[PDB]
RNA sequence: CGCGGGGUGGAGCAGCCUGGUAGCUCGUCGGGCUCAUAACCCGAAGGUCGUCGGUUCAAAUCCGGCCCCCGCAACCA
RNA sequence: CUUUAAUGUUUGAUGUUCUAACGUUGACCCGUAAUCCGGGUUGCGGACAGUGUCUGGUGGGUAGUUUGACUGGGGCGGUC
RNA sequence: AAUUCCUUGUCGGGUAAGUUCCGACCUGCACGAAUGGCGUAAUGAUGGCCAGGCUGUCUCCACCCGAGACUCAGUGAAAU
RNA sequence: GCUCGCCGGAAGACCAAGGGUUCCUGUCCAACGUUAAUCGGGGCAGGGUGAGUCGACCCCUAAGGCGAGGCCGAAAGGCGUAGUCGAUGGGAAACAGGUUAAUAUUCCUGUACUUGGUGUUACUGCGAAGGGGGGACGGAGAAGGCUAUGUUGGCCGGGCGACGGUUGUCCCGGUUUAAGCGUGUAGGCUGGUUUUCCAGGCAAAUCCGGAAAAUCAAGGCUGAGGCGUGAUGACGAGGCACUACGGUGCUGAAGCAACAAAUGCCCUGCUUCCAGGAAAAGCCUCUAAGCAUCAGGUAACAUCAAAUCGUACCCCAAACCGACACAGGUGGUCAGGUAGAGAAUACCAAGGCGCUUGAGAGAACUCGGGUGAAGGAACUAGGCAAAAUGGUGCCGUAACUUCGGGAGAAGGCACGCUGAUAUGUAGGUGAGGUCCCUCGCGGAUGGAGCUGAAAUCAGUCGAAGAUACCAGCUGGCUGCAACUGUUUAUUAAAAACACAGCACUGUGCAAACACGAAAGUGGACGUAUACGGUGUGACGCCUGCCCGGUGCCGGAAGGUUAAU
RNA sequence: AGGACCGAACCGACUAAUGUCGAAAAAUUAGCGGAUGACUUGUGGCUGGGGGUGAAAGGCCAAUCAAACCGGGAGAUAGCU
RNA sequence: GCUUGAGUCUCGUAGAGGGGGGUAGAAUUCCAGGUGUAGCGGUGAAAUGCGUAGAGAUCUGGAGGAAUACCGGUGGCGAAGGCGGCCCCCUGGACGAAGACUGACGCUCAGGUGCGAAAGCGUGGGGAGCAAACAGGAUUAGAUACCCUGGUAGUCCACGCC
């Protein structure tokens, strides 16, 4: 579970690591790996578009099958791997035809369980099937935005989507942030929540713990000098201007929702 | 202290070489001025 | 030293700005209520408008001198 | 003159439906061994979104600037 | 008090003597709760004060050993 | 030439980088060298860099750059796909000795290895930009098996000694040996072989993966070292010998044992934790379009070829970078003896230097140091500076606490040399002999030799035995920030920043936001247990009142209100 | 196991002294801090002038930074010396 | 050894006993929409609050959380705290019938261990209603109270502490 180390050293007195015995302690599947270069948040031009990105331990990209474009075929869970890129665990799933495809690991799923894809599957956690066959009031994850995209929402640790209503060609979803949303009737979803549910209690502990993760130091706005940030200046920690982002746009309560195209789908916005 | 010139002929040619100049209009105008002033060391080479 | 505001019944405070008529609450005195008090009810009285002087028909008011209170200022080398 | 009724007609303001504009950083095929791109089928949105022009508002994110003088040194006060 | 101007405020400890320091008193010019308040084991080439050790820091310097200084030969600047 | 002195984890010996003849020889001394100069990194003339195995070029690929069309943009140009470059990365193959004034794994002697072209012979299905395997990988830590390497012993050879002793448990020197091939080990990984079948590997497949039977229980792979061999060979102390006196020529003994042992190798391993740890080709293998009396593939052998460029020297410095022959800076590799935990340090070896001004004097005073009567911070802004503490083993050790600490708290005791226990013990290493055997680099037993702590008891010497170098100052009350960390390169290292953590708030994916006139990228090949902004800043106990003004979210009726 | 303790290599630069026309346009000496990580470092690339980068000092961007360097407007302007 | 103690076994009985997992209707609040219109709401009276931007009222539909009318009783269950809509699975205790069996294994119990209303605390979810603190309106000599409109913690959930 979420074990805590003893305070033998300053910086070790605030660490809580989640240990999962189901994790395969070996190596990832070579045929499904691909290099992945860190960029430090640099675009084509070369500037740091997004800050606080750098350092981090080198990682390998485990390509994951999101679409599940192999319907009507049974599959068995071989081993529960660990995918650093994802915030959840992944399950090495081998089909009936002798083919391994990585998928997100649901909550109630251990090594040795079976699953099949498609509308003919049994209503059981881990199975993926179109929402026009899924019972209204069910709990799914990895909901598709488009019939064939692969699954875009609720694909993080313990994050699920609750189906509220099925109205003709559109199914009213209830996202995690509380926003109600409509999606096409033929979109694929995946029963149950995503596994690795105890991810939220990891309390890193040291500054380096976040450093080798991939984040950088965030300098506060009151610390900067006048020309560097909208705040700055002052003889010893002085504020007085309404809180803004590094570019003047006022934060701390200003809605930036401006899409205009998806206004039609969003039913009840987060409040 | 460690000075301002730790030479490496590879980097010296990669950012000041002939082909380094024959890549941009800005570069071709620089090489243009060297011939205009009748210089012997047009650019750095051996 | 200077700038600005203030001094009004016992007490705290309006009115002043844009001059002639000084108001409000508690309080004080008398009466009533209750066996007695307070609270509450009824009523009346109560102010040299800091002080001196000037202007106007008329000055708490408008201006100036002085006394007192109050806030600020009282600096850079 | 006014309260108002039916019709015709004149433009305008909403709601719904539709497909051909358009979007498609959805699926598939081809050019092609190429996650770009173009075209072809098809699905989903749909005369919206977005773009140009005009226009009101917000706007130190950014730019060009002003912020006086005498002054028994300058500032404050004071004065023109 | 990293905040108390008036102030070395007052009282007590420390000292032969204590504008600093420790602990309290509230008359807080003008502390105060995420521009965070109040404590805290540990940590600190950090700020303050105390006791021991230790010594030329000092009382008050004395001697000695080397490199320059002085002398001789050669070479031979500088700000002004 | 003879002593003295100095570095010796460098002031030594070699590569990369970077310079560009500074390398070597003869000769010259005006100018250069901070002086002299017959000297030299200076001048003049000459000589020197020899490769199929080293490196580069070459094949492959990362970041990233360029980038046919194309998208986009006032032009320039920006972005980017197919592609094409790009090592600091992966990929074939050589070691020893001798020789020059200067070059050498490049030349000579000896002995081997790798890849292709061509040809003969005997066999035989080969064949892609496609698929599969391989390459292919993290930190930290532990142990075993070894070598480089060193000490000692025996052996061989010289000497037996200018002051007392020294034919002996005596002294000095040497006792070196590769790649390749053969064996296939300690040890590591994994269960092998066969038949049938398959919606899988964008087409196919005898290859890979998958699902069922059969049979055996071992097979396969990997692998430093030692040992043979290479090698009755080379080298080889030291004589004999000729000195143009610089050196050459010739000859040539022993060449083994034990022990200690790495940071080197086995290890691109094994165990474990987590932050989850390049790619592509060579290489092996299976086939398609096809081609089959072929072409080609496999193997043995004969033979040809392996081009080009760099190769000198400096490379921790008078040869690079700092204007200089500058007390400075510069990545990697080897790195011995005694003491020692050690690459610290001290003294030495190999090897290389005495840092390009010297000679006298012995004043004040300055810099670098030593000792210091009595006192002990009385100095001063202030214990700044110096002094002093300093090792190992053992005993012992408070308040307080987050129960880890505090703590090496503080404060003390024993250390030398010799003898004995014990002709060196415990322990480690470990031949011969013996026995067995699925017979080899095997297993037990066996114990010689070698090596070797620490302790107990006793004795003795010094004023002082961790005697030198090296090597904490300790404790108390308290402010600030939790802590390791970061920052003003060239006056500010802090209480400033950051931080894990908390809170608010923004964002439903063609995401907010950001760079960009745009496309396109980053955000993320992630998606609300996620990402961005802002504020605070471990943790513990908390975080009270105000919506007036400001900002912002929401509501839209009315009033006002632009273009049209 | 540890942003763990002690301590060389390595990196850093707290106190003092010397030096200040120096040995040197921030170094030497005696000591100090970190020393398995937010560590250090080599080679090679990328981000650029109102731009970059920044554990944030308005520090750093070739000994120059509250806006680099070079050329060009330009013989800018100067009620000033 | 015996058997009246205690305990086990064969078969049944009633039950809000306990845990996990599902589900239903009433009712409230809220959300969008339709009808429709000046009060609604509140109290001792009044006021804050809400409403002509159109509430309350009524109807249709939908999202949700907590609590389970009636049965219900000085009825039942457990050692106690305490526990009630219904349903499934796991499971404890109690009592009764006729006999058999072990053959005193029993009574109590300092310290020690476990369970233990509510409120409170911790990590992470949830939030209808109700409701400390708090705000305002009244009440009052004053009201940092009772009364009234709102309202955070909390009350709910899993895992720990007290």
UniProtKB/Swiss-Prot annotation, chain A:
Transmembrane segments: none
Gene Ontology molecular-function annotations: RNA binding; rRNA binding; structural constituent of ribosome; transferase activity; zinc ion binding
Chain positions with N6-acetyllysine modification: 241
Assigned keywords, A-Z: Acetylation, Ribonucleoprotein, Ribosomal protein, RNA-binding, rRNA-binding
Compositionally biased residues, Low complexity: 38-47
InterPro entries: NA-bd_OB-fold, Rib_uL2_dom2, Ribosomal_uL2, Ribosomal_uL2_bac/org-type, Ribosomal_uL2_C, Ribosomal_uL2_CS, Ribosomal_uL2_dom3, Ribosomal_uL2_RNA-bd_dom
Record Pfam families: Ribosomal_L2 (PF00181), Ribosomal_L2_C (PF03947)
Domain of life (superkingdom): Bacteria
GO cellular component terms attached to this protein's record: cytoplasm; cytosol; cytosolic large ribosomal subunit; DnaA-L2 complex
Outcome following mutation: residue 229 to Q: Loss of peptidyltransferase activity in reconstituted ribosomes. No change in rRNA binding or assembly into ribosomes
Record carries keyword Cytoplasm: no
GO biological process, one term: cytoplasmic translation
Annotated segments matching region Disordered: 27-52, 220-271
Note: This protein can be partially replaced in vivo by its H.marismortui (HmaL2) or human (L8, from the 60S cytoplasmic ribosome) homolog.
Role summary: One of the primary rRNA binding proteins. Located near the base of the L1 stalk, it is probably also mobile. Required for association of the 30S and 50S subunits to form the 70S ribosome, for tRNA binding and peptide bond formation. It has been suggested to have peptidyltransferase activity; this is highly controversial. In the E.coli 70S ribosome in the initiation state it has been modeled to make several contacts with the 16S rRNA (forming bridge B7b, PubMed:12809609); these contacts are broken in the model with bound EF-G.
Cross-referenced HAMAP family: Ribosomal_uL2_B
Subunit annotation: Part of the 50S ribosomal subunit. Forms a bridge to the 30S subunit in the 70S ribosome, contacting the 16S rRNA. Interacts weakly with S6 in one of the 3.5 A resolved structures. In pull-down experiments interacts with CedA.
Family: Belongs to the universal ribosomal protein uL2 family.
PANTHER family: LARGE RIBOSOMAL SUBUNIT PROTEIN UL2M (PTHR13691:SF5), RIBOSOMAL PROTEIN L2 (PTHR13691)
Protein name in UniProt: Large ribosomal subunit protein uL2
Gene for this chain: rplB
UniProtKB/Swiss-Prot annotation, chain B:
Keywords: Ribonucleoprotein, Ribosomal protein
Gene3D superfamilies associated with the record: 1.10.287.3980
GO cellular component: ribonucleoprotein complex; ribosome
Top-level lineage group: Bacteria
Pfam families: Ribosomal_L34
Keyword Ribonucleoprotein: yes
UniProt KW Nucleotide-binding keyword: no
A GO term, aspect molecular function: structural constituent of ribosome
GO biological process assignments: translation
InterPro entries from the UniProt entry: Ribosomal_bL34, Ribosomal_bL34_CS
HAMAP family for this protein: Ribosomal_bL34
NCBIfam families, A to Z: rpmH_bact
Family note: Belongs to the bacterial ribosomal protein bL34 family.
UniProt name for this protein: Large ribosomal subunit protein bL34
Organism: Escherichia coli O45:K1 (strain S88 / ExPEC)
């Amino acid at each position: 579970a979420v074990v805590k180390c003893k305070p033998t050293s300053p910086g070790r007195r605030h660490v809580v690591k989640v240990v999962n015995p189901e994790l395969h302690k070996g190596k990832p599947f070579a045929p499904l790996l691909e290099k992945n270069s860190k960029s430090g948040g640099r675009n084509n031009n070369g500037r740091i578009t997004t800050r606080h990105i750098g350092g981090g331990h080198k990682q390998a990209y485990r390509i994951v099958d999101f679409k599940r474009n192999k319907d009507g075929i049974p599959a068995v869970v071989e081993r529960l791997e660990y995918d650093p890129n994802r915030s959840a665990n992944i399950a090495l799933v081998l089909y009936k035809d002798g083919e391994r495809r990585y998928i997100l690991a649901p909550k109630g799923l251990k090594a040795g369980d079976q699953i099949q894809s498609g509308v003919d599957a049994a209503i059981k956690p881990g199975n993926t099937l179109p929402m026009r066959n899924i019972p209204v009031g069910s709990t799914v994850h990895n909901v598709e935005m488009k019939p064939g995209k692969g699954g875009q929402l609720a694909r993080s640790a313990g994050t699920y989507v609750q189906i509220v209503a099925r109205d003709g060609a559109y199914v009213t979803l209830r996202l995690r942030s509380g926003e109600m949303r409509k999606v096409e009737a033929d979109c694929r979803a995946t029963l149950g929540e995503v596994g690795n549910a105890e991810h939220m209690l990891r309390v890193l502990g040291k500054a380096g713990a976040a450093r080798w993760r991939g984040v950088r130091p965030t300098v506060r706005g009151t610390a900067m000098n006048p020309v560097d940030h909208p705040h700055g200046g002052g003889e010893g920690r002085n504020f007085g201007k309404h809180p803004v982002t590094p570019w003047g746009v006022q934060t701390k309560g200003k809605k930036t929702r401006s899409n205009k195209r998806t206004d039609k789908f969003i039913v009840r916005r987060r409040s | 202290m460690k000075r301002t010139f730790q030479p490496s002929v590879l980097k010296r040619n990669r950012s000041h070489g002939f082909r380094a100049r024959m890549a941009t209009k800005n570069g071709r105008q620089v090489l243009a001025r060297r011939r205009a002033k009748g210089r012997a060391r047009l650019t750095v080479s051996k």
